[PDB]
Curated annotation (Swiss-Prot):
Enzyme class: lyase
Keywords carried by this UniProt record: Acetylation, Cell membrane, Cytoplasm, Disease variant, Lyase, Membrane, Metal-binding, Osteopetrosis, Phosphoprotein, Zinc
Notes on how activity is controlled: Activated by X-ray, histamine, L-adrenaline, L- and D-phenylalanine, L- and D-histidine, L-His-OMe and beta-Ala-His (carnosine).
Record's cofactor remark: Zinc. Can also use cobalt(II) with lower efficiency, but not copper(II), nickel(II) and manganese(II).
Cofactor (UniProt): Zn(2+); Co(2+)
Gene of this entry: CA2
Residues of the active site: H60 (proton donor/acceptor)
Site label Involved in the binding of some activators, including histamine and L-histidine, positions: Q88
Organism, as annotated: Homo sapiens (Human)
E.C. number: 4.2.1.1, 4.2.1.69
Outcome, altering E113Q: Strongly reduced activity and sulfonamide affinity
Catalytic activity: hydrogencarbonate + H(+) = CO2 + H2O; urea = cyanamide + H2O
Result after altering V117 to A/G/I/L/S: Reduced CO(2) hydrase and p-nitrophenyl acetate esterase activities
GO molecular function, one term: arylesterase activity
Record-given protein name: Carbonic anhydrase 2
């Protein structure tokens, strides 16, 4: 799998037949169709005690890893029942500014999209959560091209270091709190991971309010490579999956 012409999302079904499943992500968020649910409590983001370990180029994107051996960086409340631990964050960006986001809002695409992955602590480890219908909780954050995001610059500078798939670098004392928007207004629906295995274990929480980043901050993302060192260079762009059919599922709004 990849995002290329012959291994793109349109081919994932042959290896991961769940691609054509019942609760696949991402989707289009029809705002007029979304249902305002008043029984939704506000989001609870406790990242004050977060511990980042490193950043790796996995060949499909770059991941920032955190220590999830203790309730250090957690998400609870909202549509969730129980505590969800942060394990990693990554992005999906486009080749141009008119694309990159996975999830869409009234068919509108953003420059990039941030995913904060968390796993349900009653399951013990990430590996066991992916075997559950309520296994994961991902926090979706859209990025638009504007003024620079000071809190994202640390991530941006270390990229020179992980240009190719396989590369990784020490990356401690990173506060995710810096990538959060002002409002925590959200949309929530049942879905999956948006890259193979596409496990239908995720509870999506997409915030209404996007963060803005500079053209230069987004430009460094596009300098990444899918390939490993010493292989023909194929730039890491359009690492996003097209929107899937909603299929009965309903999107609730917390606002
Ligand atoms: Hg699952
Ligand atoms: Zn993702």
């Amino acid at each position: 799998w990849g995002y290329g012409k012959h291994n793109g999302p349109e081919h994932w079904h042959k290896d991961f037949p769940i691609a054509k499943g019942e609760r696949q992500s991402p989707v289009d968020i029809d705002t007029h169709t979304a249902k305002y649910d008043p029984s939704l409590k506000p989001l609870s983001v406790s990242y004050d005690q977060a511990t980042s370990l490193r950043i790796l180029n996995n060949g499909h994107a770059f991941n920032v890893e955190f220590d999830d051996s203790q309730d250090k960086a957690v998400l609870k409340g909202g549509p969730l029942d129980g505590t969800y631990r942060l394990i990693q964050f990554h992005f999906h960006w486009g080749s141009l500014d008119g694309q990159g986001s996975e999830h869409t809002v009234d068919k509108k695409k953003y420059a990039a999209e941030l995913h904060l992955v968390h796993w349900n602590t009653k399951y013990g480890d990430f590996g066991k959560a992916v075997q559950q219908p309520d296994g994961l909780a991902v926090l979706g954050i859209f990025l638009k091209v504007g003024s620079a995001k000071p809190g994202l610059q640390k991530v941006v500078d270390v990229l020179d270091s992980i240009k190719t798939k396989g590369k990784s670098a020490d990356f401690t004392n990173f506060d995710p709190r810096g990538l959060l928007p002002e409002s925590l207004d959200y949309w929530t629906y049942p879905g999956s991971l948006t890259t193979p295995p596409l496990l239908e274990c995720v509870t999506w929480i997409v915030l209404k309010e996007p963060i803005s980043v500079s053209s230069e901050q987004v430009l460094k993302f596009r300098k990444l490579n899918f390939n490993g060192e010493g292989e023909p260079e194929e730039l890491m762009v359009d690492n996003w999956r097209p929107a899937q059919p909603l299929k009965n599922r309903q999107i609730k709004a917390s606002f």
